[PDB]
Amino acid sequence: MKQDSASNATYTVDCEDYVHVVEFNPFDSGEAGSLLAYGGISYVVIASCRFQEEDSTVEGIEFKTLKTFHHGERVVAIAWSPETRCDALLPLLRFATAAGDKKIRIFTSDFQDKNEYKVIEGHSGYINDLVFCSPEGTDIASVGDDHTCRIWDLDGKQIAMFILRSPGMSVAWHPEGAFKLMVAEKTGTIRFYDLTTHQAILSLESVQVPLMSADWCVRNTLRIGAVAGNDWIIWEMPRSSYPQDNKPAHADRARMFRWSKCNENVFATTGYPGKMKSQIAIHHLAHPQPILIGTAPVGSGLSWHRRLPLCVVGGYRKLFFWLTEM
Amino acid sequence: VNLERSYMELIGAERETSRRNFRDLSLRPDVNLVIGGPKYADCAGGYCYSESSSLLSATRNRFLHWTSYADTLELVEISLDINLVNNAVRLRILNCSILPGGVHICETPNNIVVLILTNQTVHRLILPHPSRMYRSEIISDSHIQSIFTDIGKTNFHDPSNTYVIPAIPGRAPNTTASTAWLSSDGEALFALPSISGGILVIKMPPHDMEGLVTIAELKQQGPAHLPVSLAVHTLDHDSYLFALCQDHKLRMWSYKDQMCLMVADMLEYVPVSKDIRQTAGTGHKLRLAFSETLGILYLGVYLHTPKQGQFCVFQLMCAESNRYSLDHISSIFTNQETLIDFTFTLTSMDIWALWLDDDNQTVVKHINFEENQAGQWNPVFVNPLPEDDLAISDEQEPQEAYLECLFAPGRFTIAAVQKAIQILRKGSGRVLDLSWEELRKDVTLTVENEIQNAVIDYDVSQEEFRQINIENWCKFYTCCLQYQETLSRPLALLVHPDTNMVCLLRKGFLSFLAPCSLVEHLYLVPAEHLLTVDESVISDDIDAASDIVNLIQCLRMIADYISEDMAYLMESACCHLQSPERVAEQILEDLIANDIDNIMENIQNKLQDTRNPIRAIGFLLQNMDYETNADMEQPQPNTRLNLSTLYGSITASSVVCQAICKISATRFLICRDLLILQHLLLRLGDMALIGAGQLLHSQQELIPRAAQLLLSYYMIRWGSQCLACAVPVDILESNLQHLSVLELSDSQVEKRRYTSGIQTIVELFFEDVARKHFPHVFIQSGASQLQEPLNWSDLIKRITNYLLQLLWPSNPNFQFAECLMRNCQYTQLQEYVRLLLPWCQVNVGSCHFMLAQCYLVAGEGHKALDCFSQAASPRLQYYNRVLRLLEDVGPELVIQLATIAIGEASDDWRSQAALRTRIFKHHLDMGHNNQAYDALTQIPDPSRQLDCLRQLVVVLCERSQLQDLVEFPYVNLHNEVVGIIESRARAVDLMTHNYYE
């Protein structure tokens, strides 16, 4: 009976309220720090994080809240826009959020007094995940429990609607190949839609159900990672629609899956918020067991740093950061 | 008497991926292979045990059926109640061709005896009767073996179970007539036509006695005397052999006396033409039925004439001088359809017959040959073959549409898909017993490989790729449809005399016949047979009956002109939550835009003949409504254990749920045509065909009601066509753990059977929930008398209506959504509650509770709040639950949520207090003195400030924040704090305490 030594968070940042979702900026903003957005009960905070591993002048972590957006509803999923930049010439901050009111709110700002938000309506069921589905950041794709994957442009109009057979639980844009959108249905079926033909190219099937998350590997666009039930699942295309690896992630309902943006072999999965403290179990493809197991006492949301090997899990009034030694 | 005129076919889907493990047995008689032997057409039949109608017998709801092609016999035992283990046998009599109608099953109080006739050998098998295999009533349903379990131990080479027919006098060549039976002494006898025109009777000794087989030839003879159909009837020591021969004469034979006792010309009853007497009757058939309660033997004979067939039923009359004569009961004519088989029952006095029309389509009809005033055959609504072409929308991907059509419940059988695969791959690879999911992936991969091989160039246009996709999938679909057409050929009919259970035996699967409700009967009957409907059956008011008939006529005239585009538009509007009223109006405008043949003027003319059309609308919408009141009384746990297995097999579930599917589909079509007709009456009401107040009633109450019924039937249809997903055991167990926290798991985990078969969510609901309540539905109907025989018609009707009332998602028990939160199909669950909640008013609180659980699992806890609170102060209770979780972390959030809870607090001050204690404790541990103090003052308990302050000062003196201690402004209880400190400090020692300082 080896007691798994829960890893303490390398850095901890205090917040004002519960963090329901947290998402780093996966794109280049022009600043020395890597942006971060976390959605609370009724707000959305944009911050700039600078760690010791980037600058020896920073002792620990330097967390600076840049702007606080009033939302009014619980934030369940945040999507960053590729046009997000913090340059002094013409700063522009754009991102999309889904809320508990089944609506999408595109916030635009220049970090100065100009702040606009737009509400997009049309979802007949709650939205589970949304991502920006164009390299220019012009379209927004959201999947939810109305059994639909919709493509919204920036003006709130619907471009296309792909009918799913079950609630989409995670949608992701192909990092390199254009016009290929991945939609992870809850009953295990992962679908790849073509945004120019509005057709489905190919479907993958998980051996376990329900499928709670899916994410692409930015460093290897052939590997797809997911979590279905208790076990994390990995596919490798165009070889076969069957899983390549299938090992237990959490003792109870692995929920979120996020591929590392710096290593093509590391991925973190967060246990479900329930009877146990929400556990993060960071894995390595070469190891049968997680290389790091941390306990976020209640954690929803998981995002990986763009350059460092550093993952974040928004907890209760706390952002827990975990460094995975490469 | 409920004249259940029209029946509907329910496909008993053999959806088990594993072929019933056909125990292959090869019997090798000492007979050489005759190259060039006659090829017999495939045949089939069924046998139903005695006492199958009894509720306590061990043969309850059990029956045997068999299909026999060239040299093979496939026996299957089916039980609607419990799944039988090893219930299939494939007997291959090598070098011998099994006769059409050469298999006869006979029953004894200890054994079941199967008598097989071939072109050269005759066989006899002996299997244990079901009442003798099981001596103990305590047998788990999982292991009840079929009587074919121990067929491998019987010696088939025993010369008492196998005899070779001699060549002289021998059997006539190319003849199919054959009969066999068990005598009163247990001897197995086999009769067949002789070369000389008589009957050749081969008699075996009893199975437990040693004896020599005896051969006798009954003779009265050219090829004109050759029997075409033979049947036997055993009377107390004797076997009366009836011979319907080529020369249009019926001959009754006595085997004991070996003398022909009656000769009856069959032509004295037909409207003779001179040409018939010179043509041989190769198409005649003969069936006998015996009524034990009356001691009457009925003879149903069919006369194949190249111009018009004829059914003739006769009663056998015995004079005092042992002279037998036929009495004419009825003569029924038929159309030019080619008969395949026909049986007639003596409990309902009906002639069941199966034909093939001139398009080779399956046609089944039935008729009452005693109360036949009109000469009309009541129709059976046979499921049509899948459509040749599949319509694909430009937004629908061809792959998904074709997979959904091929793998839809009830469309295609596993064998057709497997055969299309086998031929598409051009390989002789051993097809394993592939699961349905693996079969789907195999189809996808094979047709994808065909697509990639069809794409020669690298620069294919997207439209060109779509066309190649459609073409490849259409080729696959056409091959699948060819093989489903071959596997759907009709072979024979099996009717049960006691339970009225009728079954249609097809070459590839078994299909059950069920009685059709009045609405669907009137809607689906052809137009020529609608003008002759007995208006007394529809209503006691002749005027109301004529109104409903005219209304159904117009309902069909609207349906006969709805193209596939309008039907798909209505179905899409139902899918995307569009309003079906405006959609029906748009379809009406398109119809009036395309009224080329003046159908609209005819609909107007026919509605003019209607006196009260709104009364007819209200009648149709009342018979199609299963909205139940909350008086579904909960089950008392004292149900007799013998009823828990009633209709519990995969076949019974599939048949009942196909009944639900077909009823929902038909009534969806009726409500669609009814909405279109209602918008029509609105547009026409302006020209004074309906009154103002009547029109107000129609547009205020009748159209929203029709739209709600249409959404409801689309809901039940989608539920009956949506496939459930395979859930691994680890996830299901973690789920049943997660719900023991919420205490929805009362039922013990009693080895949930591996559902290796494909089941829709309606079938899963039927097996898990709806089947446990059938004993009480049986008991409440006045069935306290355990002697009444089971009736298939009434039982299937009550079961379908009860499953529709539960599937009208109004079930106050609410176990479908409770289960879909219990399983991890939260998906079909959110869809169910979503498509459900707007229109059904019962279980709103339960729907909201379960939607809250789905959102809790999806990670959305605040909408779980809202749906738990609509589900049910309850809001305060869920707030307390969420506060427990935040406190587990360790507490600004806790503070804020507790503050909201104060406003909502109307009942639990105790819960408030505990949460405040926890907040204070956390804050003090973290080091926040003032916040801890605030949480403290808020506590509604009598003396916590005091204890909490003791804790505070001890912790502080230890933390040594004594300057802060000095600075703190003590309250009115300043003198109290000082006193407590002093007391404690003087009570304790001086060495380990610096409290004096």
From TrEMBL, chain A:
Compartments (UniProt record): Chromosome, Centromere, Kinetochore; Nucleus, Nuclear pore complex
Record has Transport as a keyword: yes
Record keywords, A-Z: Cell cycle, Cell division, Centromere, Chromosome, Chromosome partition, Kinetochore, Mitosis, mRNA transport, Nuclear pore complex, Nucleus, Protein transport, Repeat, Translocation, Transport, WD repeat
SUPFAM superfamilies for the chain: WD40 repeat-like
Cellular compartments per GO CC: cytosol; kinetochore; nuclear pore outer ring
Keyword Repeat on entry: yes
Protein origin, superkingdom: Eukaryota
WD repeat residue intervals: 120-162
Principal subcellular localisation of the protein: nucleus
GO annotation (BP), single: chromosome segregation
Binding partners and assembly: Component of the Nup107-160 subcomplex of the nuclear pore complex (NPC). The Nup107-160 subcomplex includes NUP160, NUP133, NUP107, NUP98, NUP85, NUP43, NUP37, SEH1 and SEC13.
Summary of the function given for this chain in its UniProt record: Component of the Nup107-160 subcomplex of the nuclear pore complex (NPC). The Nup107-160 subcomplex is required for the assembly of a functional NPC. The Nup107-160 subcomplex is also required for normal kinetochore microtubule attachment, mitotic progression and chromosome segregation.
Name recorded for this polypeptide: Nucleoporin Nup37
Organism: Xenopus laevis
